[PDB]
Paper text:
To determine if this architecture was due to crystal packing, we determined the structure of H.s. CLASP1 TOG2 in a different space group, P21, as compared to the initial structure that was determined in the space group P212121. Native diffraction data was collected to a resolution of 1.78 Å, was 98.1% complete overall, and was 85.4% complete in the 1.84–1.78 Å high-resolution shell with an average I/σI of 2.8 in the high-resolution shell. The crystal contains two protomers in the asymmetric unit. CLASP1 TOG2 is 65 Å in length with a bend between the HR A-C and HR D-F triads that orients the HR D-F intra-HR loop surface at ~30° relative to the plane established by the HR A-C intra-HR loops. This deviates significantly from the flat surface observed across XMAP215 family TOG intra-HR loops used to engage tubulin (discussed further below). Comparing protomers determined in the P21 space group to those determined in the P212121 space group showed little structure deviation with low overall Cα pairwise rmsd values that ranged from 0.3 to 1.3 Å. Collectively, the bent architecture of CLASP family TOG2 domains is conserved and reflects a key structural state of the domain. Of the highly conserved intra-HR loops, most of the conservation is located along the first triad, HR A-C. The HR A loop contains a conserved tryptophan, positioned equivalent to the conserved HR A loop tryptophan found in XMAP215 family TOG domains that engages β-tubulin. CLASP1 TOG2 is curved across the tubulin-binding surface and our structural modeling suggests that it may engage tubulin in a hyper-curved state.
Numbering used by the authors: 295 to 538
The structure:
């Protein structure tokens, strides 16, 4: 998984150098990208290049312009469409560009991350490895760089999926989030974290339980009081499993 993540990161700037000739020029460039990515029947190679050009623009300093985040909102539909494409080339490029947006904007990717996250979670159970992995890596990159509390319920809600794959990944994501985010980023969501981890500890799946226990101790390190309380509501067998 570390190699796939590194592969995305290396791809971030493997895109053409572009110029931004004005605020108007930037808006029109993003308008053109929206047009290309919003058409179901538009040439797939041209869609890959349009997704790459978003990275080009970031590298040209687009994020500095007054209206940039207005422009980025406009691409909500484009990202969803791209991440749902039949062609993994398009899906994968979209996930790379989403990861790049997160790494460049950090916490200012708050709106875009929340808007696209359910769509990329829908990749997780795909039986095609390239499809699933692209979505997994995009989520991990977003969690790593965009520490936004509103993302926590989106992630935890998938803890309870009928798809075992989604459940396993969910607790992998949660483990990563607890390890990467500061305590203050978690304080509005203590209860939902505790209940989500509680459900994972009792999960029917063995791999899911193992990840949930990682989550428990991550959670404990932030909130020992609340984690100890959760611990003592557990039957004896689960308490011993946690101590292992």
């Amino acid at each position: 998984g570390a190699v796939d993540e590194e592969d995305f990161i290396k791809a971030f700037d493997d895109v053409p150098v572009v110029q931004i000739y004005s605020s108007r020029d930037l808006e029109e460039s993003i308008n053109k990208i929206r047009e290309i990515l919003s058409d179901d029947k538009h040439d797939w190679e041209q869609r890959v290049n349009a997704l790459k050009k978003i990275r080009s623009l970031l590298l040209a300093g687009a994020a500095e312009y007054d209206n940039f985040f207005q422009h980025l909102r406009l691409l909500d539909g484009a990202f969803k469409l791209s991440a749902k494409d039949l062609r993994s080339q398009v899906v994968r490029e979209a996930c790379i560009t989403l990861g790049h947006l997160s790494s460049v904007l950090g916490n200012k990717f708050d709106h875009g991350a929340e808007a696209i996250m359910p769509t990329i979670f829908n990749l997780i159970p795909n039986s095609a490895k390239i499809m699933a992995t692209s979505g997994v890596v995009a989520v991990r990159l977003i969690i790593r760089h965009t520490h936004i509390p509103r993302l926590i319920p989106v992630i935890t809600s998938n803890c309870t999926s009928k798809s075992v794959a989604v459940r396993r990944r969910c607790f992998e994501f949660l483990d990563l989030l607890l390890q990467e985010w500061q305590t203050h980023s978690l304080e509005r969501h203590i209860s939902v974290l505790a209940e989500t981890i509680k459900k994972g500890i009792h999960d029917a799946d063995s791999e899911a339980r193992i990840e949930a226990r990682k989550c428990y101790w991550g959670f404990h390190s932030h909130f020992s009081r609340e984690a100890e309380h959760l611990y003592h509501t557990l039957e004896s067998s689960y308490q011993k499993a946690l101590q292992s």
